[PDB]
Design an enzyme around this catalytic site. Structure first.
Site, PDB file in Angstrom:
ATOM      1  N   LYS A  22       0.781  -1.278  -0.080  1.00 52.07           N
ATOM      2  CA  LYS A  22       0.039  -0.150  -0.228  1.00 52.07           C
ATOM      3  C   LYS A  22       0.907   1.122  -0.047  1.00 52.07           C
ATOM      4  O   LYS A  22       1.625   1.502   0.835  1.00 52.07           O
ATOM      5  CB  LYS A  22      -0.955   0.040   1.225  1.00 52.07           C
ATOM      6  CG  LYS A  22      -2.058   1.258   1.048  1.00 52.07           C
ATOM      7  CD  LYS A  22      -3.361   1.182   2.082  1.00 52.07           C
ATOM      8  CE  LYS A  22      -4.305   2.010   1.593  1.00 52.07           C
ATOM      9  NZ  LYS A  22      -5.557   1.588   2.388  1.00 52.07           N
ATOM     10  N   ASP A 112     -11.029  -1.607  15.041  1.00 53.90           N
ATOM     11  CA  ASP A 112     -11.774  -1.566  13.825  1.00 53.90           C
ATOM     12  C   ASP A 112     -11.892  -3.010  13.384  1.00 53.90           C
ATOM     13  O   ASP A 112     -11.523  -3.536  12.234  1.00 53.90           O
ATOM     14  CB  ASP A 112     -10.986  -0.787  12.810  1.00 53.90           C
ATOM     15  CG  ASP A 112     -11.881  -0.132  11.784  1.00 53.90           C
ATOM     16  OD1 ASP A 112     -13.290  -0.577  11.762  1.00 53.90           O
ATOM     17  OD2 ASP A 112     -11.442   0.317  10.836  1.00 53.90           O
TER      18      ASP A 112
HETATM   19  C1  LIG Z   1      -1.619  -3.416   1.517  1.00 54.39           C
HETATM   20  C2  LIG Z   1      -1.765  -3.063   2.863  1.00 54.39           C
HETATM   21  N1  LIG Z   1      -2.902  -2.177   3.226  1.00 54.39           N
HETATM   22  N2  LIG Z   1      -2.702  -1.959   4.793  1.00 54.39           N
HETATM   23  C3  LIG Z   1      -1.526  -2.680   5.010  1.00 54.39           C
HETATM   24  N3  LIG Z   1      -0.864  -2.946   6.259  1.00 54.39           N
HETATM   25  C4  LIG Z   1      -1.359  -2.231   7.308  1.00 54.39           C
HETATM   26  C5  LIG Z   1      -1.894  -3.217   8.424  1.00 54.39           C
HETATM   27  C6  LIG Z   1      -0.966  -4.231   8.762  1.00 54.39           C
HETATM   28  C7  LIG Z   1      -1.453  -5.045   9.776  1.00 54.39           C
HETATM   29  O1  LIG Z   1      -2.494  -5.761   9.523  1.00 54.39           O
HETATM   30  N4  LIG Z   1      -0.559  -5.460  10.874  1.00 54.39           N
HETATM   31  N5  LIG Z   1       0.745  -4.723  11.020  1.00 54.39           N
HETATM   32  C8  LIG Z   1       1.377  -5.661  11.722  1.00 54.39           C
HETATM   33  C9  LIG Z   1       0.151  -6.546  12.575  1.00 54.39           C
HETATM   34  C10 LIG Z   1      -0.937  -6.441  11.831  1.00 54.39           C
HETATM   35  C11 LIG Z   1      -1.992  -5.996  12.897  1.00 54.39           C
HETATM   36  C12 LIG Z   1      -3.259  -6.647  12.851  1.00 54.39           C
HETATM   37  C13 LIG Z   1      -4.292  -6.320  13.672  1.00 54.39           C
HETATM   38  F1  LIG Z   1      -5.266  -7.086  13.854  1.00 54.39           F
HETATM   39  C14 LIG Z   1      -4.166  -5.358  14.645  1.00 54.39           C
HETATM   40  C15 LIG Z   1      -3.068  -4.454  14.339  1.00 54.39           C
HETATM   41  F2  LIG Z   1      -2.834  -3.321  15.302  1.00 54.39           F
HETATM   42  C16 LIG Z   1      -1.894  -4.969  13.509  1.00 54.39           C
HETATM   43  C17 LIG Z   1      -0.410  -4.801   7.598  1.00 54.39           C
HETATM   44  C18 LIG Z   1       0.203  -3.952   6.544  1.00 54.39           C
HETATM   45  O2  LIG Z   1      -1.054  -3.159   4.045  1.00 54.39           O
END
Ligand SMILES: Cc1nnc(N2CCC(C(=O)N3NCC[C@H]3c3cc(F)cc(F)c3)CC2)o1
Length: 252
Positions: A22, A112
């Site tokens: 992203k 969320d």
């Molecule tokens: C394309 C694209 N669009 N968005 C993203 N991301 C942002 C979110 C990121 C994500 O899911 N996490 N980060 C590390 C652990 C995990 C997480 C899960 C939860 F349930 C709660 C949290 F606080 C964190 C992955 C990358 O990539």
């Protein structure tokens, strides 16, 4: 540290395989804080939680890199042509409980949790995602610079109340409903003051709007998790204690 180059949207990484990515003027003032935050979120390592694989911190270009999930989100999978059996749905539920109990154990409050934040692999296994960046404050600010159906009622028309572990337990209750109704709740009526006030009054998704078989235990679980009083809702380790024996003996 955990830094990627564009030389290394669906993205085929140069050396480490398939990944999801992203993607404004550079502001050296926030680069250290963004890198610290990604390193922090990257410390979240669980089988049912999405792994943040890397970051692209380049001049005027910022990107977040997570792992690949073949079947998309939970809503996409439920709304599909081929029906998902009870045994798979029950496994999906157990995996959600596990992933959430891990996050809560690490002090992370989702805020969320929704079907769009539950990603599915080819083998129907799930991982909890944070696609709306609700747990990234630094990176959420970059995203905004020049659905309420899963939201706990204590946060509806009250932005200041601090979310808790019990705010996620409410969201789980509506995800539980959506898993069995194979659709979004409240007839997909635009989030309105009528609807918000109704939910605050005591309104919940129609249990009788579930046409397929939903076991007695799962209806009780969703009704307990969407309680108006946050203190009356269980914890995820609490939910696991009851749900794991039920899935093994009755759903698997
Ligand atoms: C394309 C694209 N669009 N968005 C993203 N991301 C942002 C979110 C990121 C994500 O899911 N996490 N980060 C590390 C652990 C995990 C997480 C899960 C939860 F349930 C709660 C949290 F606080 C964190 C992955 C990358 O990539």
């Amino acid at each position: 540290v955990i830094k990627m180059k564009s030389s290394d949207s669906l993205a085929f990484h140069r050396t480490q395989g398939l990944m999801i990515m992203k993607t404004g003027p550079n502001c050296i003032e926030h680069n250290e804080a963004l890198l610290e935050e990604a390193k922090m979120m990257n410390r979240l390592r669980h089988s049912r939680v999405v792994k943040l694989l890397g970051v692209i911190i380049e001049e005027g270009k910022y990107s977040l890199v997570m792992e690949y999930m073949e079947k998309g989100n939970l809503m996409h999978v439920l709304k599909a042509e081929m029906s998902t059996p009870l045994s798979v749905k029950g496994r999906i539920i157990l995996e959600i409980i596990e992933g959430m109990a891990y996050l809560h154990g690490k002090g992370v409050i989702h805020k969320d949790l929704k079907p769009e934040n539950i990603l599915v692999d080819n083998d129907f296994h799930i991982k909890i995602a944070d696609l709306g960046l609700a747990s990234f404050k630094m990176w959420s600010k970059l995203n905004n610079e020049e659905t309420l159906y899963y939201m706990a009622p204590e946060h509806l028309n009250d932005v200041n109340a601090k979310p808790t572990e019990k705010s996620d337990v409410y969201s789980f209750a509506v995800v539980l409903w959506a898993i069995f109704a194979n659709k979004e709740p409240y007839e997909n009526a635009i989030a309105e003051q009528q609807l918000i006030m109704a939910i605050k009054s005591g309104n919940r998704p129609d249990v009788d709007d579930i046409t397929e078989y939903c076991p007695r235990e799962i209806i009780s679980l969703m009704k307990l998790c969407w309680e108006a009083n946050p203190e009356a809702r269980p914890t995820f380790p609490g939910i696991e204690e009851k749900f794991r024996p039920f899935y093994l003996s009755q759903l698997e």
